[PDB]
Design a binder for this molecule. Structure first.
Ligand SMILES: [Cl-]
Ligand SMILES: [Cl-]
Lengths: 129, 129
């Protein structure tokens, strides 16, 4: 987990993003919810890092990742509404699991913004807004 | 898990619901996603059972429950669109965690329908549509 977290931080910095908080902690509405907070030229983001390791089903990993995304997005609206949340996904996962019809559709239905990163090279491949 | 599953089945049957599948299996769009399928007077439902045990944070349990709910709901639309999905929550959880401002708001923002059940008495307390 720490490794993939560091890969995404590296990929962000290579594109000129400034890491401002890690973890970004969010407390709201009676609940305390490691997200990466970053910014570039005043544009603020939060990144939910996932590795989608073969150790568990991609679908089980997706359930938790999706729920986290919706909760974090909902919380951020009411705490830091200018900070946009992205789900960070490895390119390999993006090209396989996320090209299957169902996950692709759920992501779109739920406006799940994504940061697709190449793990080996530690770079940002694509932002999906 | 099996215990709470049986409690909800018991609660459903006491209210005249006929259990038709357990587990209700859902395969769609390249993914194979124990939901309870039940019906009464032609009205069809699917129930996602959660116990919200103190072993883990309620928020962590909620992330996974929410993601599962959204995925199952989205899959059911495209497979069995007349079967309405409910998140089954214990009354104790309902009166505590789900009365906190944040979870309450996320549930409403996401149309998370609920079946609130009393665990000790094994009855359905409230349907939240
Ligand atoms: Cl990759
Ligand atoms: Cl209860």
């Amino acid at each position: 987990r720490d490794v993939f977290h560091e890969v995404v931080k590296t990929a962000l910095k290579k594109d000129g993003w400034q890491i401002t908080d890690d973890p970004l902690t969010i407390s709201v509405g009676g609940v305390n919810l490691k997200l990466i907070a970053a910014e570039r030229q005043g544009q603020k983001i939060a990144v939910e890092v996932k590795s989608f390791l073969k150790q568990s089903s991609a679908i089980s990993e997706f359930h938790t990742a999706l729920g986290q995304f919706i909760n974090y997005r909902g919380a951020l609206r009411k705490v830091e509404p200018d900070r946009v949340l992205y789900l960070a996904v490895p390119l390999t996962t993006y090209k396989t699991f996320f090209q299957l019809d169902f996950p692709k559709e759920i992501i779109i239905e739920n406006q799940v913004k994504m940061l697709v990163y190449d793990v080996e090279q530690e770079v940002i491949f694509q932002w999906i807004n």
